Design a protein around this ligand. Structure first.
Ligand SMILES: Nc1nc2c(ncn2[C@@H]2O[C@H](COP(=O)(O)OP(=O)(O)O)[C@@H](O)[C@H]2O)c(=O)[nH]1
Length: 330
């Protein structure tokens, strides 16, 4: 699937940057365009893979290149005031050549938290391709203000995209490590999962149709190196992905639609594993629709299974954020 990726804020920027590197290393053809938007000048300079002409500094009149800290209200205001700066950069993207936009951002801060939903709304207003969000939730160790920002940002972001894919840092914390060291490993985990998803063969239509019901999505993932053997290995990965740690933890029962993706060398893929996998996923989810296919990749030394679950509900983490936002209103 061909994406226009826009990273918003420091986290969104680093994730999109890594996505570009991943896509390039594997010749995956995923990141057709990459743009980074920030109010902190130093953050944009630190990027490695996003073209300098696609790094947009906004809010100069308000924060003079110094960021908005964790003031997401100000983040939303600068995104609204300076949306034409962002559009300036987007105008260089060959939009006719993309299947969808993806707006990537941490929700706990200020620039991305406030600006990502503003951008998503702007994009849906002028383009007709789907606009998805990838929202990254904060660690519970960061502090109450970051949780509150995320709660408020989530409420708005989910309403402005066609679907909000979620990755929760709190479920993926790396304990013994430095903050930045933790983010480097987390960003690898993020890109390996969504990179496999966006990479009979699964086409973009199947992804778009899986996401079309809107709301929140979560991704399961398992991988391993290296006819019954093939089938059983596949069904095992499917189980490991469904029961393993999700990008956003939740009960998978009640998901609206599911998509199974198997990626690997053709000789270690077959139809039977995928068909059994789809039935098993339906048993575990009760999903309305369960699609499944593969990404044949010659020369690959790993097989990876990804399950995309769209329209998940009764998610404790989401119910927490809603409660957090509601209390702060009152
Ligand atoms: N996965 C990931 N999350 C990050 C990273 N950096 C920051 N975060 C998370 O993103 C939130 C916003 O931080 P940041 O993007 O720097 O703030 P912003 O630039 O004001 O939007 C933080 O509260 C963290 O939860 C990163 O490199 N990777």
């Amino acid at each position: 699937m061909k994406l226009a990726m826009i990273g918003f804020g420091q986290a969104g920027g680093k994730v999109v940057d890594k996505f570009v590197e991943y896509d390039r290393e594997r010749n995956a053809g995923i990141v057709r365009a990459a743009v980074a938007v920030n109010s902190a000048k130093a953050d944009l300079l630190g990027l490695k893979n996003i073209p300098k002409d696609q790094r947009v500094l906004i809010g100069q009149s308000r924060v003079k290149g110094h960021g908005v800290g964790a003031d997401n209200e100000l983040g939303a205001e600068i995104a609204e005031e300076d949306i034409d700066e962002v559009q300036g950069a987007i105008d260089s993207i060959p939009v006719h050549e993309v299947d969808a936009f993806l707006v990537v951002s941490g929700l706990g801060g200020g620039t991305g938290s406030g600006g990502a939903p503003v951008l998503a709304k702007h994009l849906k207003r002028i383009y007709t391709e789907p606009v998805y969000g990838l929202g990254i939730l904060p660690g519970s160790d960061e502090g109450g203000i970051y949780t509150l920002n995320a709660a408020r940002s989530f409420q708005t972001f989910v309403r402005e995209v066609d679907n909000l894919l979620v990755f929760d840092n709190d479920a993926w914390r790396k304990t013994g490590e430095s903050v930045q060291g933790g983010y480097d490993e987390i960003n690898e985990e993020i890109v390996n999962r969504f990179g496999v998803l966006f990479g009979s063969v699964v086409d973009s239509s199947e992804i778009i149709n899986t996401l079309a019901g809107g709301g929140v999505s979560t991704v399961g993932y398992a991988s391993e190196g290296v006819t019954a053997h093939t089938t059983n290995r596949i069904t095992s990965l499917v189980r490991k992905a469904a029961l393993g740690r999700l990008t956003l933890p939740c009960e998978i029962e009640g998901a609206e639609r599911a998509l199974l993706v198997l990626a690997g060398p053709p000789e270690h893929l077959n139809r039977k594993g995928i068909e059994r996998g789809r039935k098993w996923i339906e048993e575990q989810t009760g999903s309305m629709e369960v699609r499944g296919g593969d990404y044949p990749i010659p020369g690959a030394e790993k097989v990876a299974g990804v399950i995309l679950l769209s329209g998940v509900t009764n998610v404790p983490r989401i119910k927490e954020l809603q409660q957090v936002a509601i209390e702060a209103q009152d």
